[PDB]
Structure 1
Amino acid sequence: SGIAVVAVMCKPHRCPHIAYTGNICVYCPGGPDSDFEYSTQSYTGYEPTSMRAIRARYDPYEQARGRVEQLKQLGHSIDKVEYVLMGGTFMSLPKEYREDFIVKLHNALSGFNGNDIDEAILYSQQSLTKCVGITIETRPDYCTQTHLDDMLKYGCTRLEIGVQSLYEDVARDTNRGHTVRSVCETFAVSKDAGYKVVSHMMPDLPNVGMERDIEQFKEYFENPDFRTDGLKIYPTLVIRGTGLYELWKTGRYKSYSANALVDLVARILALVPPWTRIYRVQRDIPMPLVTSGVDNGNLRELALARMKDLGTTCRDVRTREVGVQPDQVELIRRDYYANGGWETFLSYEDPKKDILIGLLRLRKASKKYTYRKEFTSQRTSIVRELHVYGQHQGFGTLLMEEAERIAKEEHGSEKISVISGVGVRNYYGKLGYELDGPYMSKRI
């Protein structure tokens, strides 16, 4: 089996930082103020997801339903689907459009027909084709206390922030619109609300040279400010109508050769700690559109082969699973400090074959943060995801048995709380948990 990934795009709109800056990001292609016909921001219209959107005319009930039943004409036999939103700055849209968007995302699985956001998720809880999560990408200045609890009502569990640089000059000179000391503060309120925080990083930006790229990513996992649970490596591509195309035209910006770039990402993956995953090493842009930058579309395996003859194994949690039988497994945990709280990473491992079975995240709720009403009347601890691959069945109930014993004793908590998605709310109701708002919690 597995998890079905259905990607939808919202209405093509303008970012909200075009007003007070004067324009959008230097490297961003596409959008309404471009030459691509009827394309969402940061897209070209020639992508296999972005071609299903234009034929659907961005109708969320008809875009998602055509994608779901397409994947079962191939015969994947889907019953657990995780939505992901992309394109634009979805939380910058008007409030009466965003809530009606998410409602028809749920109606394509349940069959309920209505417009109340507070009632559509209740019908979606007893659905049989169920939603395990919704990924919504946004900007770091749109994760305030007003926006983070709107995502809890929508059913969102994972959110993605474009960081793309850890230097102050790069976020200024590329007209990014925020500061790097501001994104390290909104990571803290997001992880204490219970979200899986994934960030985006971009090598080969302007004015960041070859050597500055490797101390950029060494800092990203040594500093306890960031230490997130995921990355999407997006190397810089020069596109036709972008802002950096004129820098390529007048000879004031040149890119990497495709022997030093694959050497770079063979060193970046060497520093990846075992609690984070690398979703993408490059993005799906058809190479006839791109002028300079990445030549081919096979940078993933060319990076794994380049670290074969360096002796270094990429210990990535996207790489280290069954995809070879364990025959045995141990229980280990890892403890790191991330941006205000004590994160732990429980997993079942084999140190010989280097393969993972299950994993879990858990966080002590800090005191400088955590504005939520349910997490203030007493000292609580937040479990953030459970993710078991595939007897080989009781790995879920073992990770919940251990995360609860470690919360009463070592955290000293009176309540444990889950950020389970709507379709998987019934798996926790059997284990003694009860719903209180967005969370599925229990007094210890």
Structure 2
Amino acid sequence: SPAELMMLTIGDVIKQLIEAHEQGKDIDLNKVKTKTAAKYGLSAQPRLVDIIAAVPPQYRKVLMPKLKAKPIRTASGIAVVAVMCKPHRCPHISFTGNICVYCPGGPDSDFEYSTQSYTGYEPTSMRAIRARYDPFLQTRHRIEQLKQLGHSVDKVEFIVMGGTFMALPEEYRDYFIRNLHDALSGHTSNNIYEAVKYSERSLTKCIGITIETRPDYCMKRHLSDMLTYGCTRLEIGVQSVYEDVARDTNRGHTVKAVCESFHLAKDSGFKVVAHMMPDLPNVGLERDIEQFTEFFENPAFRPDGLKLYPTLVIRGTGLYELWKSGRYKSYSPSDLVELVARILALVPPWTRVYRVQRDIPMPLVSSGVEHGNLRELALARMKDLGIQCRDVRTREVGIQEIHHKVRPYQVELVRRDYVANGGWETFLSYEDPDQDILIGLLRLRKCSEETFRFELGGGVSIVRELHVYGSVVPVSSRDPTKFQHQGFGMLLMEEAERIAREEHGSGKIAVISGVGTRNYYRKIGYRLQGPYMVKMLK
């Protein structure tokens, strides 16, 4: 039978690998796989996961740096776990009578047992459906998969998806957040504060949480509530900078509300990521370029991250009815690629693009995008036109290392200042100028005159993000072929503490952080106050 032949082939492969390790010579895996499969008479080849899932323990520890699969999953310095909430209705269904004109799925739809703005056939959607929307099971399952691939899960970040999370009853939000923290740490708590304490003392660090919210649910109350949870990032859907579009699609709010929410969130200390949608109705091929030029040149709009979602028409929505009646037509594919190239050429060097298109399966789409690799096609077109993309994602060491083959040689220090949302922003970085390679970054902001938090009033400057890229280095370990634990963090904080005292004129510095970061900043010399890590500068 093929099964025992497969097993013997696998065992022989690990035997050769461990022998070669013992006498200490390098070995090529593909040739060994083919040769060993030839002997036992097979019609297939071994899979990497199978070879990983049969190593003895000590050898399992020693020889993972050769059998790892999908090296992109931890090429940015963290491990990402995505979880989903319970199905529910969007808050503006009541006082308007209906929801956005293009959103698919939801509690009242033909997509059975699916969350709003999702179909249920997606990877994460099918993971939570079989788990019946339980945060503990989802976290455990995803961490098990990540460990089975062969990655290190020392540092974790959560992403909470679904509809509007902050519109649910308080008890459910308590349940969800405390279960996430307990799943990481291993405790069995009763409320948020107990879970937060135990997670602070944990060994599997929780770097931060990300939540998606609407501009009318981002006020002082909601911001404070999210501050107690441990959240550090926000996702808001702007979709357009034009006031007529925001009311012809039954969005439910206005652009001025979006700007005010941006101002409050940035003064409180969060990070802002914006969803934008090209090819909206009543928006031609010339208003998109102006839209994005204003987006990146007007101080009221400048965000920290972007998500480009070209418009898709899906069955069971108002836009579907518009499309059937012969009143709405999509762009041609060449025009779409050209537009995306032009848009990507405008992104400033301090902005990071996380995703470039949706992930709806192709057969469910009636019109719109049909391919599945828009980003790389756009990059090739940009190379043809002679322009270049200079965002954050396509300039860091891991991406430059796996897509191209380059390494930093002549690292230098760079600083960029600007004005945004009524505040004076600075962006410090360590990067290689000649090859255009990014290593580590830090964001700093001087608090404006309209801050409401008690801890930040009276002359406080706040640090909003500190990050060093590369592959993941486990805590208290060192790897001379990677970039993390080599002192680029205490160099970036010493400079932030000099700007905040000699230029801002402040007398205190505050940091928003997770929990493992709490221990790190305690090591540096900061103390704890409220949900912040503060330090006197006098």
- TM-score interval, normalised by the smaller of the two chains: over 0.9
- The 5 Å alignment of 1:6-17 reads 6-17=81-92
Aligned to 2:440, the other structure's residue is in SS state: strand
Q: CA RMSD in A?
A: 0.9
Q: Aligned equivalents of 1:75 and 1:339: distance in 2?
A: 43
Task: Answer yes or no: is 1:130 the counterpart of 2:205.
Answer: yes
Q: CA deviation at 1:284?
A: 1.4
| Equivalent residue, structure 2, for 1:429 | 522
User: After superposition, where does 1:189-208 map in structure 2 within 5 Å?
Assistant: 189-208=264-283
491, 509, 514: which one aligns with 1:398: 491
Matching of residues 314-329 of structure 1 within 5 Å:
314-323=389-398, 324-329=406-411
- Offset, 1:325: 1.5
| Partner in structure 2 of residue 99 of structure 1 | 174
Q: Distance in 2 between matches of 1:98 and 1:242?
A: 30
Q: Distance in 2 between matches of 1:11 and 1:358?
A: 37
**What secondary structure does 2:256 align onto?**
helix
Q: CA deviation at 1:53?
A: 1.0
Aligned partner of 2:165 among 85, 90, 102: 90
Q: Determine the structure 2 residue equivalent to 1:374.
A: 455
CA distance in 1 between counterparts of 2:518 and 2:372 reads: 39
Q: Give the CA deviation at 1:422.
A: 2.1
**In the alignment, is the contact (CA less than 8 A) between 2:135 and 2:179 conserved in 1?**
yes
The question of 1:386 aligning with 2:466 is answered yes
Note if 1:336 corresponds to 2:429: no
How far apart are the structure 1 equivalents of 2:150 and 2:185?
Answer: 20
Among 135, 142, 146, the alignment partner of 1:71 is 146
Distance 1:137 1:422 in 2: 21
The Cα shift of 1:141 comes to 0.6
Q: Choose the corresponding residue for 2:428, options 346, 354, 370.
A: 346
Task: Please give the alpha-carbon distance, in whole angstroms, between the structure 1 residues aligned to 2:280 and 2:409.
Answer: 46
Q: For 2:371 and 2:514, how far apart are their aligned partners in 1?
A: 37
Displacement after TM superposition at 1:423 (Å): 2.8
Moved more, 32-41 or 383-392: 383-392
What are the ranges of 5 or more consecutive residues in structure 2 without an aligned counterpart?
1-73, 399-405, 471-479
> Match for 2:488: what amino acid?
F
The Cα of 1:266 is off from its aligned counterpart by: 0.2
- Counterpart of 2:532 in structure 1: which amino acid? Y
2:224 is aligned, of 146, 149, 153, to 149
* Whole-angstrom distance in 2 between the partners of 1:79 and 1:56: 24
Provide Cα deviations, 1:330-389, integer angstroms capped at 9, x if missing partner.
11100110011100010112221011110000000000x21000011x201010010112
SS at match of 2:160: strand
* Equivalent pair of 2:212/2:235 in contact (CA under 8 Å): yes
Cα distance, 1:72 vs. partner?
Answer: 0.5
Aligned pair count reads 442
Cα deviation, residue 143, structure 1: 0.6
Alignment of 1:9-408 (within 5 A): 9-323=84-398, 324-367=406-449, 369-376=450-457, 378-390=458-470, 392=483, 393-408=486-501
Asked if 2 retains the 8 angstrom alpha-carbon contact of 1:125 and 1:424, the reply is no
| 133-142 or 67-76, which deviates more | 67-76
Q: Residue 331 of structure 1 aligns to which amino acid in structure 2?
A: L
Determine if contact 2:410/2:433 at 8 Å carries over to the other structure: no
Shift of 1:252: 1.0
Return the TM-score normalized by structure 1: 0.98
Deviation for aligned residue 1:115: 2.0
| Aligned residue among 482, 488, 503 for 1:410 | 503
- The residue number in structure 1 matching 2:58 is none
The letter of the residue matching 2:346 is: L
Distance 2:284 2:326 in 1: 16
Q: Work out the CA distance in 1 between the residues paired with 2:508 and 2:318.
A: 51
Equivalent residue of 1:195, what SS?
A: coil
CA shift for structure 1 position 144: 0.4
Say which structure is richer in helix: 2
Percent identity of the aligned residues?
Answer: 79
Please state whether the residue corresponding to 1:35 is helix, strand or coil: coil
Q: When the two structures are superposed, what TM-score results if normalisation uses the length of structure 2?
A: 0.81
CA offset at residue 123 of structure 1?
0.4
Task: Indicate if the aligned counterparts of 1:417 and 1:442 stay in contact, CA closer than 8 A.
Answer: yes
Q: Distance in 1 between matches of 2:94 and 2:487?
A: 54
- In the alignment, which of 421, 433, 439 is matched to residue 532 of structure 2? 439
- The structural deviation recorded for 1:128 is 1.1
Runs of 4+ in 1 over 4 A off after TM superposition: none
For residues 80-101 of structure 1, what are the alpha-carbon distances to aligned partners after superposition, in whole Å with 9 as ceiling and x for unaligned?
A: 1100011100000011111111
Q: CA deviation at 1:33?
A: 1.2
Task: Give yes or no for contact 2:104–2:316 (8 Å, CA) kept in 1.
Answer: yes
Matching residue's letter, 2:278: P
Q: Indicate the structure (1 or 2) with the bigger Cα radius of gyration.
A: 2
Q: Deviations over 1:61-107 (max 9, x none)?
A: 11111111111011112111100011100000011111111100101
What CA distance in whole angstroms lies between the structure 1 residues aligned with 2:460 and 2:162?
36
| 3-state DSSP of counterpart to 2:524 | coil
Gaps of 5+ in 1: none
Q: 2:8 maps to what in 1?
A: none
